[PDB]
From a paper:
Many streptococci adhere to protein-attached carbohydrates expressed on cell surfaces using Siglec-like binding regions (SLBRs). Siglec-like binding regions (SLBRs) are among the streptococcal adhesive modules that bind sialoglycans. SLBRs contain two adjacent modules: a Siglec domain, which shares some features with mammalian Siglecs, and a Unique domain13 with no close homologs outside of the family. The conserved sialic acid-recognition motif governs general specificity while sequence diversity in surrounding loop regions allows the SLBR to select between related sialoglycans.
For SLBRHsa, this included structures from crystals soaked with the high-affinity ligands sTa and sLeC, the intermediate-affinity ligand 3’sLn, and the low-affinity ligand 6S-sLeX. The resolution ranged from 1.3 Å to 2.4 Å and the diffraction quality loosely correlated with ligand affinity. Instead, comparing costructure determined with sTa with the costructure determined with sLeC shows that the position of the EF loop differs by 5.9 Å. In the strong and intermediate ligands, the invariant Neu5Acα2-3 Gal effectively superimposes and has similar hydrogen bonds. Differences in the SLBR-ligand interactions predominantly map to the variable third sugar of the glycan. Biding strength may therefore be related to these interactions.
Numbering used by the authors: 245 to 333, 335 to 449
């Protein structure tokens, strides 16, 4: 056996202030995989260094016959919690999944984007706003679109909240005097909703 384990990963996008969890699938022609490391490219054959330190991983059922077949691949959990203080611009971390078969053949690390989604993957860190796609709210009819009262601003925010149960509970929804909506996430990134997607009046 001189064929290394083959890996299928994916496009692993993660977001500040949020947990993430992805699975990679690993097969070997022998049907068995004994070890899995996720690592930075540098450091040579024995390195297990992986950064950022909040990237965790685990593999169940290692070292058992038939644990890594085409019909039932071995799976490695890749998971963690992204801190609020990560720098984003998106930020990118290209990483490698190395698996070993019983003969000691290890998946090779090849530095080319054409291998992305195989043993090589890109972990993309985005701001928290990018995880959400604020939904179409129920229109709030106000007296005058150029001057919402406090009660009208609160009504618009409540309609947006009711239409968006998946946004973080501690995100803050605010509405301006012309009905423009701002959603401020825990990581302090924002989404905006133009007024005429949420408010109308009967002045015409
Ligand atoms: C084999 C070896 O030791 N050579 C290293 C050389 O590999 C290393 O280059 C790194 O190569 C990897 C792919 O193998 C990436 O291309 C690294 O580029 C990026 C990345 O995608 O990982 C770009 C990205 O924009 C960077 N992110 C941020 C937030 O800055 C990351 C990031 O700096 C690193 O991932 C942190 O570990 O790097 C590329 O750097 C170079 C430089 O380390 O050194 C050779 O000797
Ligand atoms: Na093999
Ligand atoms: Na499986
Ligand atoms: Na968004």
């Amino acid at each position: 056996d001189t064929e290394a384990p083959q890996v299928k990963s994916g496009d692993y996008v993660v977001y500040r202030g949020e947990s993430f969890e992805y699975y990679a699938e690993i097969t070997d022609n022998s049907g068995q995989v004994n070890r899995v490391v996720i690592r930075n490219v540098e450091g040579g054959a024995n390195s297990t260094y992986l950064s950022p330190n909040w990237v965790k991983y685990s593999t169940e059922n290692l070292g058992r016959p038939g644990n890594a077949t085409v019909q039932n691949p071995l799976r490695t959990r890749i998971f963690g919690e992204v801190p609020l203080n990560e720098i984003v611009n998106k930020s990118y971390y290209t990483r490698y999944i190395v698996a070993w078969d019983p003969s000691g053949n290890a998946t090779q690390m090849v530095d080319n984007a054409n291998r992305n989604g195989l043993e090589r993957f890109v972990l993309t860190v985005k701001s928290q706003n990018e995880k959400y796609d604020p939904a179409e709210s129920s229109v709030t009819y106000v007296n005058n679109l150029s001057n919402l009262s406090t009660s009208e601003r609160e009504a618009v925010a409540a309609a947006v909240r009711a239409a968006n149960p998946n946004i973080p509970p501690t995100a803050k929804i605010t509405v301006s005097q012309n009905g423009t909506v701002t959603i401020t996430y825990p990581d302090k990134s924002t989404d905006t909703i133009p007024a005429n997607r949420v408010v109308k009046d009967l002045q015409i």
